[PDB]
Amino acid sequence: DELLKYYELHETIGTGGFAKVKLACHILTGEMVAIKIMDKNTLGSDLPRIKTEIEALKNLRHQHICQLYHVLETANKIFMVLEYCPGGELFDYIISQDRLSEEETRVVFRQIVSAVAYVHSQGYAHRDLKPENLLFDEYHKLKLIDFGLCGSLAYAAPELIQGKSYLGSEADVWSMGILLYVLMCGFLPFDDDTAAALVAKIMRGKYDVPKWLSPSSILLLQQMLQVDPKKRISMKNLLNHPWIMQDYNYPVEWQSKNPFIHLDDDCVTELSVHHRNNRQTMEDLISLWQYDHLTATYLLLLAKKARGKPVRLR
Ligand SMILES: COc1cc(O)cc(Nc2ccc(C(=O)Nc3ccccc3)c(OCCC[NH3+])c2)c1
Numbered sequence: 686d687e688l689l690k691y692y693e694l695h696e697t698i699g700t701g702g703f704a705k706v707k708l709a710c711h712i713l714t715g716e717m718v719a720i721k722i723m724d725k726n727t728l729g730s731d732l733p734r735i736k737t738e739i740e741a742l743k744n745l746r747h748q749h750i751c752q753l754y755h756v757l758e759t760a761n762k763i764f765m766v767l768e769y770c771p772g773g774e775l776f777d778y779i780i781s782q783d784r785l786s787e788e789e790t791r792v793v794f795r796q797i798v799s800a801v802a803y804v805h806s807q808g809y810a811h812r813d814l815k816p817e818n819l820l821f822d823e824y825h826k827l828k829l830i831d832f833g834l835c836g837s838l839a840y841a842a843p844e845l846i847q848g849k850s851y852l853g854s855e856a857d858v859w860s861m862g863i864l865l866y867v868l869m870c871g872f873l874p875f876d877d878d879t880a881a882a883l884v885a886k887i888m889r890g891k892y893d894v895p896k897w898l899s900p901s902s903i904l905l906l907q908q909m910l911q912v913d914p915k916k917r918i919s920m921k922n923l924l925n926h927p928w929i930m931q932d933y934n935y936p937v938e939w940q941s942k943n944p945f946i947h948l949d950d951d952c953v954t955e956l957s958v959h960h961r962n963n964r965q966t967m968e969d970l971i972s973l974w975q976y977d978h979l980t981a982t983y984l985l986l987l988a989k990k991a992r993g994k995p996v997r998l999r
Contacts, residue, residue, distance in 0.1 A: 690712075691711065693709060699721070702727070704721050718754065718766050718985075721767060742765075747799070747800055747943070750800050751829060753976065772820065773820070790868035798861065798939070804829075806940075814840060815839075815864065838887070840859075846888070859917065862910040866892070875887050875892060890911070890912035952996055953967055954996075955998055956979070
């Protein structure tokens with residue numbers, strides 16, 4: 686925890702057997718941040734599992750995907766600096782409310798669908814969608830985290846389950862079906878004690894359908910949760926499914942609303958005075974997009990400027 690002369694570490698909020706997250710604060714900007722701290726000695730040959738995550742995240746920029754700011758590799762630690770999401774967890778939200786109204790699940794699902802549709806357009810699949818992977822920011826907007834791709838068999842598609850060849854996207858829509866189910870009901874559509882009776886239930890593909898589910902809800906579950914992946918609903922069709930649009934009558938807007946197009950002059954200007962060098966060379970240096978400290982500093986001034994705060998380093 687040494688090269689971090691960029692951040693003032695605060696408290697722990699995430700504890701895993703693979704990794705542990707700490708709240709931190711970006712010295713130069715003032716901006717708050719979350720730092721996933723790994724042990725390479727725990728990973729062993731799960732470096733692949735994380736390095737393919739990082740290159741994945743380097744290629745993503747969406748309003749509903751947790752932003753990656755910075756990577757730092759020391760002798761035996763990997764540090765990911767990530768978008769601060771102080772709204773809380775999707776999962777814990779669900780259990781705190783027992784289950785969300787149909788109209789609240791819809792508002793949220795549309796966010797999930799937005800994230801995932803964008804993921805697919807960029808050439809990836811999440812392949813592990815679940816409540817534990819969705820965070821809320823302070824405006825209660827969802828941030829998809831934790832790319833990575835043990836046992837979320839509960840959320841795994843049947844053809845994934847059984848070593849069959851598969852499309853990631855068709856896999857993901859399955860998992861979105863399960864998620865939807867648990868937003869509206871508060872428990873998993875397929876469940877048992879051991880793993881074997883769980884897998885058996887998935888392969889049969891039929892589930893209890895609580896009294897409170899609406900005709901439209903019951904419909905969309907069926908189209909998402911098809912065993913035969915030929916018969917599952919495409920993303921294409923999800924984006925503007927009548928249930929999806931039942932309350933806000935517009936298709937899901939999946940395209941990145943914050944795209945990276947040009948460099949932002951102000952940020953480039955502050956970064957230029959601070960690093961006592963000229964505009965061209967500061968653009969050249971940022972354009973290298975190394976996700977080093979300068980890339981963090983840039984992304985965070987950009988976020989500072991969106992809050993309408995002055996665009997300044999300390
Ligand atoms: C792509 O985004 C990723 C990848 C990944 O491997 C892990 C995470 N995990 C995160 C990221 C941020 C937070 C966070 O900002 N949490 C927070 C902030 C303020 C107050 C309370 C919590 C995070 O939170 C911990 C939840 C899961 N243990 C996890 C993102």
